[PDB]
């Protein structure tokens with residue numbers, strides 16, 4: 001229920017200096033994201049394929065849901081790590097607005 | 112990326128007889144759903160609380176993400192079981208449209 005990383009960058013955007021300070025970590029996260037999203041799409045495709053061929057529960061369905069679950073969990077965890085990277089690159093006085101947005105979105109299920 | 116159960120009921124709604132045949136299983140799923148959504152909200156709240164008090168990675172963050180991941184996986188699995196219950200309660204000649212919607216939505220990541 002919400003793209004946490006995009007919510008943060010939109011609601012409390014980095015200032016000019018912070019954008020420079022975080023450039024490398026933003027690049028590395030964008031790549032990590034992508035990689036995990038690739039795993040996630042493949043897992044969804046495997047689930048869809050299993051069910052298209054055999055429209056019933058089977059061990060392939062159980063396994064594909066486990067694979068989806070873990071890839072989604074991995075993306076949530078990698079995104080949180082990068083959310084803390086961003087917080088580290090903020091001016092300290094900007095952290096309270098950041099925390100307001102972060103906590104509120106987490107409570108709503110944003111990842 | 113999509114409420115699979117709602118997508119099915121909207122795109123290929125049950126006919127009058129099928130609605131009657133599936134009434135019990137729809138009631139039981141609505142309840143199971145709710146229960147799992149309760150777990151999910153609590154897990155999100157725990158994650159938000161951990162991070163509101165300690166804005167950094169900790170074992171409480173790791174654990175809360177594991178709890179979210181498993182509750183989301185459980186909801187996906189329970190929803191699939193109920194999706195197969197619905198398919199069982201359809202007239203056989205309605206299953207091809209149902210499968211079209213189901214497979215297409217799964218491929219897109221709907222749960």
Ligand SMILES: [Co+2]
Nearest residue numbers: 005026082086
């Ligand atoms: Co960022």
Ligand SMILES: [Co+2]
Nearest residue numbers: 116137193197
């Ligand atoms: Co239903």
